[PDB]
Structures are given as C-alpha cells and as structure tokens.
Amino acid sequence: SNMWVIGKNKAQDAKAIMVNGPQFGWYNPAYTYGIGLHGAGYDVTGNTPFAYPGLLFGHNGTISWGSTAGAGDSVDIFAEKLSAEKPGYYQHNGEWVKMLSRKETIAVKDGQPETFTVWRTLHGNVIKTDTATQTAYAKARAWDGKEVASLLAWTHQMKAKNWPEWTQQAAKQALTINWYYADVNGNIGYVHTGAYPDRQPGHDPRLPVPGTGKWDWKGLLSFDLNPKVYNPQSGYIANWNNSPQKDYPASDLFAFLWGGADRATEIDTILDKQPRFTADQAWDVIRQTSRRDLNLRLFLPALKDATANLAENDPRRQLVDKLASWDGENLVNDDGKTYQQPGSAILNAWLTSMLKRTVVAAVPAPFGKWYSASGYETTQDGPTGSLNISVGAKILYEALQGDKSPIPQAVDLFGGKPQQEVILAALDDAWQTLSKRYGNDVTGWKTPAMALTFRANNFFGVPQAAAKEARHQAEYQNRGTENNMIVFSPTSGNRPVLAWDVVAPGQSGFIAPDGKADKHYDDQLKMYESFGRKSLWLTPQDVDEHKESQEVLQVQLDQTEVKIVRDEYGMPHIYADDTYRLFYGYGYVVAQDRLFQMEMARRSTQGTVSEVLGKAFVKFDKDIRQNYWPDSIRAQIASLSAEDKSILQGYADGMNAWIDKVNASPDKLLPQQFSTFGFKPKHWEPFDVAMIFVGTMANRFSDSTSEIDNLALLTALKDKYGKQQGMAVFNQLKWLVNPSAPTTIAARESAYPLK
Numbered sequence: 001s002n003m004w005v006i007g008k009n010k011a012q013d014a015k016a017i018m019v020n021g022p023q024f025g026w027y028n029p030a031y032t033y034g035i036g037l038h039g040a041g042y043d044v045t046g047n048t049p050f051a052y053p054g055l056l057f058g059h060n061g062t063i064s065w066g067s068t069a070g071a072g073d074s075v076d077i078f079a080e081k082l083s084a085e086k087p088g089y090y091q092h093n094g095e096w097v098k099m100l101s102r103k104e105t106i107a108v109k110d111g112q113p114e115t116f117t118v119w120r121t122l123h124g125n126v127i128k129t130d131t132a133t134q135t136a137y138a139k140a141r142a143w144d145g146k147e148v149a150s151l152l153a154w155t156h157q158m159k160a161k162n163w164p165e166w167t168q169q170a171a172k173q174a175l176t177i178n179w180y181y182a183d184v185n186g187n188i189g190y191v192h193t194g195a196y197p198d199r200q201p202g203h204d205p206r207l208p209v210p211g212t213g214k215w216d217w218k219g220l221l222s223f224d225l226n227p228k229v230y231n232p233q234s235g236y237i238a239n240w241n242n243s244p245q246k247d248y249p250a251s252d253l254f255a256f257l258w259g260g261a262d263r264a265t266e267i268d269t270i271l272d273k274q275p276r277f278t279a280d281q282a283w284d285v286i287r288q289t290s291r292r293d294l295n296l297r298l299f300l301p302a303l304k305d306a307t308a309n310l311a312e313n314d315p316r317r318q319l320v321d322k323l324a325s326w327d328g329e330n331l332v333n334d335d336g337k338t339y340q341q342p343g344s345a346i347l348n349a350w351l352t353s354m355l356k357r358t359v360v361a362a363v364p365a366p367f368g369k370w371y372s373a374s375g376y377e378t379t380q381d382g383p384t385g386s387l388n389i390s391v392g393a394k395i396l397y398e399a400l401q402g403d404k405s406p407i408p409q410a411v412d413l414f415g416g417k418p419q420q421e422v423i424l425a426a427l428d429d430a431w432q433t434l435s436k437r438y439g440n441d442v443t444g445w446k447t448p449a450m451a452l453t454f455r456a457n458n459f460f461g462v463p464q465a466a467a468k469e470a471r472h473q474a475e476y477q478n479r480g481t482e483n484n485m486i487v488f489s490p491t492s493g494n495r496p497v498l499a500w501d502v503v504a505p506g507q508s509g510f511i512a513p514d515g516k517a518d519k520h521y522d523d524q525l526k527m528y529e530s531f532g533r534k535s536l537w538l539t540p541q542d543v544d545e546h547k548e549s550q551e552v553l554q555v556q557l558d559q560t561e562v563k564i565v566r567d568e569y570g571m572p573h574i575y576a577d578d579t580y581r582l583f584y585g586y587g588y589v590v591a592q593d594r595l596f597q598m599e600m601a602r603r604s605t606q607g608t609v610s611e612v613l614g615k616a617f618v619k620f621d622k623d624i625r626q627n628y629w630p631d632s633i634r635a636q637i638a639s640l641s642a643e644d645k646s647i648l649q650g651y652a653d654g655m656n657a658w659i660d661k662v663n664a665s666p667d668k669l670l671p672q673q674f675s676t677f678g679f680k681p682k683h684w685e686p687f688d689v690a691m692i693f694v695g696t697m698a699n700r701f702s703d704s705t706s707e708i709d710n711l712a713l714l715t716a717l718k719d720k721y722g723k724q725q726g727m728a729v730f731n732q733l734k735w736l737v738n739p740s741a742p743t744t745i746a747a748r749e750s751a752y753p754l755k
C-alpha cells in the first residue's frame with residue numbers, strides 16, 4: 001500500500017494533494033465500495049473496503065484522510081505453563097488459573113459436521129499446544145478488546161475539521177495502521193496509529209515469553225510515543241509499508257524487515273526531482289511506481305563492479321550491460337504478452353541464484369526456504385498483491401553494503417569467497433537458464449510480462465462471485481487496488497476541493513437472476529487499466545448535477561424517510577438527519593450493490609462458509625473460529641452508547657430492508673450467485689457488521705506474529721553456530737531495528753525514544 005501527501009510548499013496550483021494506493025489484491029466485485037454520507041454531522045465522499053461504516057479513503061470538504069499498512073510489533077506469544085494433573089489450567093502469579101473454553105460446531109453442506117473447542121487464557125486465545133514442554137501458546141494482541149472502538153474511531157475521524165480533532169480519533173484506533181491527513185489550508189500530517197505494549201525490561205518481542213506472570217506487559221504505551229509528524233520540513237509524507245521513523249521496530253514476522261533496501265525510496269526519488277507537483281503530476285506518480293523494477297537500483301552497482309574487467313564477448317558482461325542501459329521501467333510490447341526489456345527476468349534469475357549461494361546456504365534447513373524468493377514470483381494470473389524487495393534480497397543488500405551496513409555480519413554470507421566470485425557465479429547460472437530459454441542473443445529476448453487478475457474468490461480463498469466472473473488485465477501494475485486523490489484549494493475553478501478515484505471493476509457487483517449484469521458492474525475496468533479516474537462529488541449541487549437517479553427510502557422502524565442519490569457511476573449518496581437513519585441508508589445501498597460479496601465476507605469472517613459451500617472450507621472455518629472470541633466482540637457492542645450502537649444497528653437494519661425485498665421477489669432481485677451456490681440471504685445484526693471489520697481489517701493487517709517459528713529458527717541457528725554466534729546470526733537475519741531503514745518521518749523531525 002502506498003501514499004504520497006504533498007503540502008503547500010510542494011504543491012503546484014493547490015494547497016495540498018493526497019494520493020493513496022492501498023494494496024489489497026484484485027477482486028471482482030471490487031475490494032472497496034464507493035459511498036457518500038450527508039447528515040448527522042457527516043458530509044463525506046470516498047470509498048472503503050467491504051463497505052465499513054468508516055471510510056478509509058476520502059474527504060469531508062475540510063480535511064482528507066487515507067491509510068497504509070506497515071505494522072510495528074503489537075502481538076506477542078505467551079508460553080503458558082501447564083499442569084499434568086490440572087488439564088485446562090495454567091500457572092499465573094503463583095496460582096493455577098482455569099482457561100476459558102467454548103465449543104464450536106462447523107455445519108457442513110452435504111457433509112459431516114465437526115465439533116471442536118477453542119481455548120483462551122488471560123493472555124489471549126491458545127494457538128498451539130506442545131506436549132513435550134507442557135506449554136500452551138497464547139496470542140496477545142495489544143488491540144484485544146478495542147476492535148469495535150477502532151471501527152468507531154475510523155468513522156468518527158470523518159467528522160474532524162483540524163489536526164487536533166483528527167489526532168483525538170487516531171489515538172482511539174488500536175490496530176497498527178498508518179493514517180494520513182491533509183486539509184483545505186495546505187496542512188499535512190501523519191500518525192502511525194495503534195495500541196502498543198509497554199513491555200518488561202529485557203523482553204525480546206521476536207520470541208515467546210513465559211506466561212507465568214513475570215513477563216506480562218506493564219500495560220500499553222502512551223499515544224505520545226506513536227510516530228507522528230505535522231507539516232514536515234520536506235513538504236511531503238510518503239510511505240510504501242516502510243518504517244514510520246528512525247529506530248521504530250517492525251512486527252516480529254521473519255518475512256518482514258525495514259532495512260537499507262526499501263521500495264519506499266522509489267517514491268522519494270520521484271518527489272525530490274522537482275520542486276512542486278500539480279494534481280496531474282501527483283497522480284502520474286502511480287504510473288511511474290507501478291512500472292518500476294525494485295531491484296535494479298539495489299544490485300546494479302555490485303553487478304557493474306563484479307563485471308568491470310570482463311570483455312563485451314563475455315555473456316556475464318552482456319547481461320550486466322543490458323541492465324546498465326535500462327531505465328528500470330517495465331513496459332509491455334504491442335503483443336500484450338512480453339516486456340520491452342529483459343531486465344526483470346535477468347534480475348530474477350541472478351537474485352534467485354545469489355540467494356541460494358548466500359542467505360539460503362547460511363541458514364539451516366528447513367529455514368533456508370524463508371529467504372529463497374527473489375521477489376519476482378508470479379503465476380499465469382500474475383502476482384496476487386504488490387511486488388516488493390524480498391526478505392532474502394534485503395539481507396543480501398546489507399551484506400553487499402559491508403561496513404556501510406549498520407547490521408553486524410555475524411556470519412559472512414559469502415562463506416569466505418570474495419563477493420565478486422559469488423556475483424559472477426550467479427551470473428553464470430542466470431546465463432545458463434536464460435540462454436537455454438531465449439537463445440544466446442540478449443538484444444532479442446522477449447520475456448513474459450506479468451499480468452493482473454481481478455479474482456472471483458476473496459482474499460480468504462472463499463468465492464465472492466462465480467468463477468467465470470474473474471477479470472483480466474494484460475499489464476500487471478504495482479499499484480493500489482483502488483487509487484484516489486484529493487486536491488485542496490485548487491487555483492483553477494470555483495470549488496475549494498476536488499477529488500477523484502477508481503473503483504474497479506465497478507460500483508456494483510449485481511448480476512440479475514437472468515444473468516444480466518448491472519450497468520455499473522464493470523464500467524471502471526478500462527479506466528483502471530489506463531490510469532484514468534472519475535470525479536468524486538461532495539456538495540449537494542455537484543451530486544445533484546451528476547446524478548443518474550434519486551429516490552426516497554421508508555425506514556422500517558418508524559416509517560420516516562431517507563433520500564438516496566446515485567451518481568453517473570452508480571455511487572450512492574445518503575441524506576439523513578441522524579446516525580441511525582444515515583447508516584440505514586448506507587446498509588441498504590450496500591445490500592443492493594454487493595449482497596453476495598457481503599454475505600460471503602460475513603461467512604468468511606465468522607467461519608460459516610462450509611454451512612453453504614461444503615467440506616472444502618472446513619479447516620478454513622475452524623481456523624477462523626479459533627482466531628477470535630465472539631463474547632469479547634458482543635460485550636464491546638453491548639457496552640456502546642446508544643449513538644455508537646445506532647451506527648451498527650442502522651447499517652444492519654438497512655441491509656435487512658433490501659434483503660426483505662429480495663426474498664419477496666427472488667425471481668427478479670436475487671443475485672444470480674445465490675442461485676448458483678444454492679442458498680438465500682438472511683438478516684444481519686450489529687455483530688455481523690462489526691465482524692466484517694474485525695475479520696478483514698484487524699485479522700488481515702494487525703494480527704501478524706511468527707514468534708513460534710522465530711524460536712525454531714533461533715534454536716537451529718544455535719545448534720549450527722553455537723549459542724553466541726547463533727544469536728548474533730538471528731540478529732543479522734531478523735534485526736529488531738535497522739537505523740539505515742528509509743522512514744516516512746525524517747530523523748530531524750523525530751526518532752523513537754525507546755531503545
């Protein structure tokens with residue numbers, strides 16, 4: 001996910017420009033949902049994943065907001081001490097405490113149901129038990145018990161009118177997500193939001209800690225410690241999942257590092273090349289970053305040095321000369337099947353061989369496979385997400401930096417051989433593989449282009465459309481699933497704010513019972529491919545002047561009415577006087593546009609897929625249920641104020657109003673996928689609405705830990721290199737922090753005070 005926010009000192013013909021590209025993968029229907037909300041203190045326009053009540057990408061006429069992933073470490077594993085004589089108990093503060101447990105039955109269509117038990121301790125749900133060590137591993141998330149408050153913070157931030165009001169809501173968002181701000185006066189800001197644990201001294205957050213009491217978190221760190229910047233000296237804020245600030249620690253995933261090699265550097269390269277950017281030029285950064293090879297910049301210097309004394313008749317030199325003449329941008333040939341230059345294929349073959357000879361060889365099996373990917377992995381459908389510099393390549397980059405790297409090289413990744421020798425041997429391997437495939441003339445190689453697919457299964461691997469609904473795009477683009485831009489105080493025109501976005505394939509996922517797709521089913525697919533965009537309207541006049549339809553909706557609870565206006569792309573705008581009715585309108589239009597997608601997202605987030613799709617989803621459903629505690633979510637909802645509850649209740653009741661119409665006339669209104677998969681939609685409750693957000697936001701971007709696997713790697717490293725060198729090699733592959741990491745906030749603004 002990327003973002004660039006350009007302030008008054010860096011914007012041309014405007015006071016601020018915000019361009020966001022969240023990367024969630026590609027799907028049909030669209031991952032995000034376009035919506036405008038007008039009333040009850042809200043006046044917003046934008047789009048948001050799974051139609052959450054809170055819009056992730058949009059503006060209110062005064063401020064605009066966005067987000068990117070890039071988790072720090074807010075998830076730890078507590079190794080609970082068990083008793084052979086007291087099963088279901090664990091030791092805490094000198095006593096045997098009983099675990100909570102719940103029974104769950106997975107109903108299976110045309111199959112056999114399965115019952116299992118989910119266990120939970122004061123640290124969290126149990127994710128693994130180990131007989132030999134009498135341990136039950138419990139997953140502690142700093143945001144546990146704050147899932148519903150996080151959803152409400154994302155909704156209430158839409159009403160903020162300045163930096164202090166907005167940061168007040170940012171402090172209430174507990175998931176580890178980057179938040180961005182821009183406003184009508186040209187101010188820009190960033191907050192790396194999230195609840196973070198205040199750990200005991202000596203707690204290494206990359207590995208499990210005993211759950212017996214001594215290692216319990218002291219509590220949560222203050223919001224004063226969350227990285228933030230307002231109007232940075234640079235005049236811009238850029239991010240591509242990289243570190244928020246100097247010395248800020250990343251999540252403990254062995255596959256995730258913030259090091260000297262980072263793709264975010266590519267955005268800074270573009271933004272620093274000219275003093276100011278217009279709205280069109282800021283949008284054009286999407287085209288440029290989408291086509292950038294991320295590895296050329298990192299490895300070309302070492303490749304040129306290794307081949308410096310080779311003659312042009314040497315194939316190793318021919319490969320490097322081809323990379324040296326390349327601008328590093330990938331373009332597709334007229335055939336729509338091959339790249340104009342072979343550079344990425346050459347880097348893939350070389351980097352794959354380099355990793356095998358360096359990082360992979362230094363790590364004992366079976367852990368070498370964690371560092372073997374080059375970053376170019378793809379299928380005929382193309383990459384399922386963004387392209388990044390691989391974890392193996394990041395570690396190799398530090399080794400190539402030598403003394404310039406701040407990471408101590410506890411093990412020489414080159415194994416005693418000079419770095420030029422290994423680089424040349426990898427070039428020999430790449431030459432053998434590539435010349436066998438394309439012949440010996442590198443100037444004529446037509447390497448395959450990566451393609452892009454809007455998948456019919458959602459990110460969980462669960463159908464949200466029929467298989468024939470997959471859509472194809474010839475050119476893979478390393479960009480947001482959606483892209484949106486807000487321009488504040490443009491000098492041209494009479495509007496104080498302009499906004500655009502692209503929600504592909506379309507606003508609607510509706511396919512009628514007879515197979516007829518809605519007119520807004522795929523009318524944004526060509527616009528997506530060509531880097532186009534459509535206007536987002538906010539004011540009643542702009543919405544009215546660009547409308548395709550207008551209607552009134554009678555609220556089932558009291559027969560009052562809300563107004564819904566849809567724009568020329570089918571995007572709905574809700575007009576209501578209070579929270580309950582505003583969110584009722586929202587729920588209703590979501591049920592009209594995305595009912596099958598939302599019903600499948602509801603089943604995905606609650607682990608109730610097998611009930612309708614059969615035995616194929618049983619272990620998926622079990623894994624979902626093991627990873628949450630419904631009583632916690634229900635208790636959080638029960639304790640809400642009437643006003644906060646009205647958001648969820650209004651939304652569910654609104655969906656229900658349309659579901660009632662669908663079920664009374666299914667021959668005309670039932671989305672075709674319900675007939676294809678053989679079931680009917682049923683009513684929603686506030687719990688269902690909360691679980692769309694918990695299951696697709698909290699569990700997708702804020703529930704990452706590999707501490708158990710990290711411990712197994714550390715154990716194997718100590719077996720191979722000894723206790724001392726083994727821990728130092730662990731620090732080289734999975735450093736806590738790397739001061740050379742490119743950061744969103746410049747070191748001169750602020751650094752992380754915790755060491």
Ligand SMILES: [Ca+2]
Binds near residue numbers: 207
């Ligand atoms: Ca951790």
